[PDB]
Structures are given as structure tokens and as C-alpha cells.
Design a protein around this nucleic acid. Structure first.
Lengths: 94, 71, 110, 67
RNA sequence: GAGCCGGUAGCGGGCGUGGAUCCCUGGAUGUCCGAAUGGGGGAACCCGGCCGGCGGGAACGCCGGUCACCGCGCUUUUGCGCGGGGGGAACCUGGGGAACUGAAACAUCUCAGUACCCAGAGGAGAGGAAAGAGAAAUCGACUCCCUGAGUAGCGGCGAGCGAAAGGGGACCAGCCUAAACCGUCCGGCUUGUCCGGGCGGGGUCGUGGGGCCCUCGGACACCGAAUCCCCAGCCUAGCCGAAGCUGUUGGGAAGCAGCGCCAGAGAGGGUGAAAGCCCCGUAGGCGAAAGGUGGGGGGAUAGGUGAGGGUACCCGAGUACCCCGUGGUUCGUGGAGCCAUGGGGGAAUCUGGGCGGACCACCGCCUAAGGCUAAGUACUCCGGGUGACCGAUAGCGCACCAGUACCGUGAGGGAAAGGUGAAAAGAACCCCGGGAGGGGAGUGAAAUAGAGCCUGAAACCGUGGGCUUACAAGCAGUCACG
RNA sequence: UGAGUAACGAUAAAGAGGGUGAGAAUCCCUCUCGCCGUAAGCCCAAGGGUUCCUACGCAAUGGUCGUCAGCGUAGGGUUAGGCGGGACCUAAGGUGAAGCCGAAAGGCGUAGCCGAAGGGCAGCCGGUUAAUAUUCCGGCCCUUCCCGCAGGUGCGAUGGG
């Protein structure tokens, strides 16, 4: 209920450059909305976010020996940090 | 029911066999019709303590506004 | 052939077998019966994978399809389950009783 | 465990929320170890999902049975 | 009752008799779309007003709650309070309503008030206490089953269509109102005493009330949901449930054999092949709950009901009745009723009026223009039992990730496809090969039961064997013979 | 069966050397050759929706071949105050208080509301990725909004122009 938690981190070859300069990449709840990505980030971590970018994306093709379905609708979200400071766990991990 | 009356309520069906007769004088009538037909009423009205209408129908208008003038 | 069965894991003689010899039930299954009972190894033959120590052919896989490994071995040999009462204040205990009346209770034994 | 239900009964409102909101952040933990810890963590995501549902439930009850 | 984390196994981790999962009722959240309804819209998306809530203030974004329209009484000022709103396999009622065909053509006719369209209600619907039936001074709400009777009958009297009473039979109740009389109550108009609105009685169930005056009277009849209360039945979670073992051939028995036992329980299904006594919360029989349903029972509340006379009279429905125009009933203008009505004229209060008699005299039967109603019967979406019913090109279009694939702008059409074995023990390991694929090796009672895998048929295709064939005739063949 | 016959989807034609691989006229490099060139080139829209891309793979599908592929398995992939579209507008048509209708369902219609490749409103050049750009990065460049501060105004509806 109306919780702060709506996200889950991306592991693109892209994303790691963003970590090289603090442009992070969370998957999010596919109905988040810029500003809420902001406050969800500030609250769930503590930084001053500047710019949030969002990015719908979706699977298709996927088969199961005989039958045919699709990977669930999905919503990527770039985000940044202003000083260049903070969130480090994410870049240290990988 | 928008071609009914209001003090009463009226909209009937019909067939209309035409054709001859000459029964009680000679042979017997011709007939030849299966044609369904409308057969219907009317509109008009008056005034409240100022401001009205009515719609109603014919005989039940002589009766009609009799009644409603009778308030 | 539903929630309904028999054995806890217990001690069990077989009948329809080609073995008939018996000892304790080690695993059972509800919906399938099959309940393996430390008897009748076979093979599968395991590949050559490192999950295996590398050498092939396992010696042991187990399913006694019958729900006819005749139940329970009290002092009397084979016997069917019956019922219970309660005796002891607030109980259940649908104990083995036919001929011999061993519990199957988890006290000193199973 | 029924413990959980004890203290869940015991708190009255927004206290219970600072609780549950924390425990959700512990979900953010476990979801970010999607990459690695995974193991003993399995029970963590599942137990946490569950019992957070519990605290929400009892919160729903107190919200009802008060006003 | 103690194993579990659905179909589904594997990676993996964990939780259980200090009652897990599963099951049953309830409670909770319940995204968005849909009657959709805060407004828009190309359904699943958009855009907001309003009080509130967090985040960096506001901005901007969320989080919660409210905002549709109509009729209903309302508060005739406050939309406050009610209700509708839609959706259903079949059944029903009403509003509409057809042709092919049938008549050996074809309109009258029939197919046919059918199919179908739409409105409406429900678990049933309508129907329903007589202005009847019709011949007996008889019947007595209605519906449903039988028979009446394929008769009475209607018809280009051609096709064909086709009752009703009457008798058995099921289930079996009747009620509430306008009678304007008064009271009284408001409220009107206008004043007094006419009207509008309530309450009593009366507000008739069989033909009667009111007013008047005398005798009444001082309870069993219980709801047409009365109202409640349990046995209240089901929802599943129901539960016990009786009785046998050895040998024996075989991969296996529960066969065969030696005995022996239960039976208010020898129905059936399962387990390597053929069990009453192994299993089968399975029959026999019994046994079940705090919660969600109502008859049979019982009370009760019991709303409510209930004379005898006399007297002039006062009052039951405003449109009946006649006429032209049609429909129903067996009726198609027929001597034609009757009920229903679209116009047109327009009445009376039981010394009244409708009906059998087209009409009239007589004789009866009834008492209209307000309304409501259990049961008997019809149908299956959902359930359970039964098959001289299929048993996979049969059965439903579908025995299994079909109203899907797929075809179609679209409404719509609409398929294939089941079965390895007792258990996988679905094949390690070697050899050849790019791997596929095979040969051994293996498990199996059998792999010629090995993965489109039981049985495996014909067409068809091939390999080897036997006779036969290059100067020939004829689809086929057949008889004679060498 | 016709039949291993017709056909292989334009008469813009290729040839070689090297590599990859078990196998390559077909795939990848190299050098020759030829056709298009106002199109067979580069963009935007409608449309299709996942390939695109990368690493794997070659049973099937590519009317042949394939060690390749716009095919299979898995993995990664599109970022906007100013680009378009909705929080702005209206045309036709639609829908719709009022109202009129209609055996029923529904028909029509004012005001109003919806409706666009028309109106209007604020960016252009460069860089970088295996795969996105005027969005990410740099460079300059502007808009509407909220709050504070100043100076000033009779401000003021979207009603008349």
C-alpha cells in the first residue's frame, strides 16, 4: 500500500558507464512517474536526484517446446545524481 | 409509449380484408387481404396555475380538461 | 487413493513382489502411492557429470507401486489398521490393533 | 509466527506503519540481492512478502474495528 | 492426519503432530476495463474538480475519500434517504411478426401467431374467485395430466385446421381497495356547510353495505410474506466400517491347490496377470459442525376476522350499450354470438344492469369497467445417481496448455491431435560419424515395448530367393498339356 | 501415376586469390568486372511489431547449397521543459441539457463537448555506443509555471471588439 518501494536494478553493458558517472538504471513499477521515481530514490537511499529518465520496453518472442508467450511489460528508468556524490554500493558490486 | 393518451392509453393493430359481399342477396363475398395496418388517436392541451400542455385524446379531452380544470 | 492412506513411514512386509522380505518404510507419497521402502534397487545409470563423482551408473532408485505392501509389523506379522478411541483425556490415535495391538505411536518407536 | 501477530496486535497505528515500511525496505534489500545472495535469501523474499501481508492485515483490522 | 513449497519434473533453499499443505464456510484487501457513472475515449487508456495525506515548499506528482443520469416519497428551500441501472444455457408473458413450403400453379386459406426482433419478470412465469359454464331449478377460483375427440365443428366447404364443457387426477387459500356516509383531520377554494389530502367504520369474496331504531356481543380461525423458534437440509470439511494364510507354476498371482473366515457390507475400481477376507474415509450401516439456506413441527405474536330484525330511500367503479373497422374462440363479414377493442354517439344504482335465446316473450345464471396473490405444471447454465448410450473419423464442434490454430474487412466459419512399461530402470560407457544416426554394451519377463513408442492391417515402396520372357498379340482370363 | 520430366520468380552478368570449417559456385576478407544513379541512394509518415544488435546454433523454413540469415536458443537494445501527440483549439461528421419524435429498440436536434497532416506554442551544430538521438554528453540557445524582491497599474472574466 502506497509504499516507497517500486524498483529493481538493471545490468546492461550500458548501465555501467552510467555508474562510471552516476547515471543509474533501475527497472521500476511499470506505472511509476518521473517525479515518483525521484522521491522513491531519495527516500529509499538518500541523495539529491537531478533528472529522471524513463523508458518503456517489452519482451515478445518466447516459446516453450510447443507453445507461445511473451515476457511481461516492463519499464526501465535512468536516474542521476547531482554532486556526483553517493550511491556506491551499486558500482562496487559490479 | 409515445402515441398513447394519458388519462387513458391507446395504440391498436389491424388487418383490412376488402373484397366483395353480396351475401344475403346472392353468392358469397370475395376477400383477399393480409395487410396489417395502424389505427390511431391525437394531441393537444391547456394550462396549470399558468404554464402547461396536456396531449391527451379527443373524448377523454372533453372529459380530460373537464377533470384537470377540476384540479 | 486420495488424502486417505496408511503408513507413517513405519515397518513393512511386502506381498506382491518377488521379494516379500521386509523392513522400514523410508519415504511415502500421497497422490502417487509408490512408497519406497529400503528395498529393490535399480540403476538409472548416472551420466558422467561432476555432480556425480565422475564414474557412472548409480545403484539405487526406489518406488513400490503397490499399495499392497501389507501394513505394519507388531508382534503379529501382517495386519490392517482399524480405528482408535481416545482413552487418554483428549486424544485421537488411530492405532494399529488388528490381531496384535501395537501403537505405531512415536514413543520408543515410530 | 504467532509472535508476529502478538506485536502486530500490540501497536496501534502509524507506529505499525514505521514498522511495515521498514520491513519493505528490507524487501528492497532482498530484491537487490537478486544477483547473488539468492540462496538462504529465497526464504527471505517469501517470508517477508508473507508476513508483511500479515502486518497489513492486522493494520486493516485495527483500522476497521476502531472507527 | 502429519507431509509439504499448484499443473511439473530440475536449479535450489526451507516448513511440519508445541495439528503444515489440502478442504469447508465466513473477513480482508481487491490494479484497470466493462451497465461504468467525476468528464473524454479508438474497452484495459486519458484528463480532472473538490477536503484530506506524505516528498524538495509551492509548483509537479502521487496516496485516500467524494462527484451518473431517471423515476420514488423527501426537505414544495438543502440531494439527504430509497429504488432502478445490467447480465443469464432453456423455459414464460406481453409488444411486434415473414416466406420458402402445403394446396400437385396460385391470392383466399396453410406453413403460423411459428421462426425471429424488442420490452419484462423469475426460479418459475402468467393465470386466478365468476357481469362464468350450460342445461341439470346443476356446476362452483385457476393452472396442469388424462379422456372428451380428431368428435362438435370452420373453410377456393378444396387442402387441411379443430374445441369446450363433461368424468377421473394432482395440489388444494382466498384476499385487499373506490363504496364518500360520518367522524375528524388537515388543506383548499372561497366563507361557512363546494374542492384537495389522511384516518377509522364502511371500506361486500357469491350478490350486498350505509343511516335509522330494537335484540347483538363479551375468544379458538389462523395468515395470502403474518413474525419468530428450533428437528431446522444442504456447503464441504463425514466416519467407522466386518473377514486368510501358506504352498504352487511363472517376470510377476489375488490363478491353480491345501485348508479357513466375514457377510443389515459377493456393488464396483485399483495392485506386474483372474481377490468378498490387500488396498479402495467404497460399498452395509452409522456417524457428523461455531457459521450460509425453510418446508414438515410447534407455539406464539395473531395483522386481521366474526349477528338478529325493521325502515323510504343514500352508495361500487368514470366509456356500459348502439354504429362503422378488426382480432381472438373451433368461425375465414356467415343467421353470428360472446371477451377484447381503433374511431363515432354516450347509460343507469340491485323495482339496477350483463349472459344462454341473431332478434323478441318467457326462464334462469350472474353481478363488470380497481388490484393482489402460494401448490399442482415447463427448462437446464450448475450438481448427483442411471445407462439392451458412444467408446476416439464414433461421443459435444473440442479425453486435454481448441471455440484456440487458422481462414475472414468484418458478422462468421472452424480442424487436427489419446494410450511406451509393473516402475522408467527414456539407455551411462566404447566404436564410426560434424553431429545427427547407428553397432555393441546394457537395464526389461519382451525393445521388432525405445520416445509418434501398445497391437500395426491394405494401397505403396523396396532386397534376396523360386518359374517365366526379345519374331511378337493381349486388360483380364480360362480349359486341355507338357 | 504424370517424372526425377516442367519449373528455380526478369537477359543488371561476373572472375580469381586467401581464410574460416568435416564439408563451402553460394559465407568472410582481397583485386578485378558490371548495373542503378533522380534511382535499385538518404530521410518522415502509414503499416508490421520485434527484430535490430551481440554471442551461439544449424534438424527444420530460405523454391538448391549454407560453416551464413531479416530462421532457432539465450543475452543486450530505444532515455527528451522545448521532436511529434495529449494536459490548447476548432472544420465535416459525431454526441448531446433544452426540446421534438418514435408499436418497442430507437429516430432528430439547440447550447455545449468530442474530432485534424488546419490553427498555436520553446533548439541548432557537433561528439559517443556492437545496437538510441535535436533526448545521453559538450557547445551555445529560449518557454510556460510557482515563491521571494523591486518598480509600476484601476487591475479584472473569456462576456463585446
Amino acid at each position: 500500500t502506497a509504499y516507497d518501494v517500486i524498483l529493481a536494478p538493471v545490468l546492461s553493458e550500458k548501465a555501467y558507464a552510467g555508474f562510471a558517472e552516476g547515471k543509474y538504471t533501475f527497472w521500476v513499477h511499470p506505472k511509476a512517474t518521473k517525479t515518483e521515481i525521484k522521491n522513491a530514490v531519495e527516500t529509499a537511499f538518500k541523495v539529491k536526484v537531478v533528472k529522471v529518465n524513463t523508458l518503456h520496453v517489452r519482451g515478445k518472442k518466447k516459446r516453450l517446446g510447443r507453445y507461445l508467450g511473451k515476457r511481461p511489460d516492463r519499464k526501465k528508468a535512468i536516474v542521476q545524481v547531482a554532486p556526483g556524490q553517493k550511491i556506491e554500493a551499486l558500482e562496487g558490486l559490479i | 409509449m409515445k402515441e398513447g393518451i394519458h388519462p387513458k392509453l391507446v395504440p391498436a393493430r389491424i388487418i383490412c380484408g376488402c373484397g366483395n359481399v353480396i351475401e344475403t342477396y346472392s353468392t358469397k363475398p370475395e376477400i383477399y387481404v393480409e395487410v396489417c395496418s395502424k389505427c390511431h388517436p391525437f394531441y393537444t392541451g391547456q394550462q396549470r396555475f399558468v404554464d402547461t400542455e396536456g396531449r391527451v385524446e379527443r373524448f377523454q379531452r372533453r372529459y380530460g380538461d373537464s377533470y384537470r380544470k377540476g384540479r | 487413493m486420495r488424502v486417505k492412506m496408511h503408513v507413517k513411514k513405519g515397518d513393512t512386509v511386502l506381498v506382491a513382489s518377488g521379494k516379500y522380505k521386509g523392513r522400514v518404510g523410508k519415504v511415502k507419497e500421497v497422490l502417487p502411492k509408490k512408497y519406497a521402502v529400503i528395498v529393490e534397487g535399480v540403476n538409472i545409470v548416472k551420466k558422467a557429470v561432476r555432480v556425480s563423482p565422475k564414474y557412472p551408473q548409480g545403484g539405487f532408485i526406489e518406488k513400490e507401486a503397490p499399495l499392497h505392501a501389507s501394513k505394519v509389523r507388531p508382534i503379529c506379522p501382517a495386519c490392517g489398521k482399524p480405528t482408535r478411541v481416545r482413552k487418554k483425556f483428549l486424544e485421537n490415535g488411530k492405532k494399529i490393533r488388528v490381531c496384535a495391538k501395537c501403537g505405531g505411536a512415536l514413543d520408543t518407536e515410530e | 509466527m504467532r509472535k508476529q501477530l502478538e506485536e502486530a496486535r500490540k501497536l496501534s497505528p502509524v507506529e505499525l506503519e514505521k514498522l511495515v515500511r521498514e520491513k519493505k525496505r528490507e524487501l528492497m534489500e532482498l530484491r537487490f540481492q537478486a544477483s547473488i545472495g539468492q540462496l538462504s535469501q529465497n526464504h527471505k523474499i517469501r517470508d517477508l512478502k508473507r508476513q508483511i501481508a500479515r502486518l497489513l492485515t492486522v493494520l486493516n483490522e485495527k483500522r476497521r474495528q476502531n472507527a
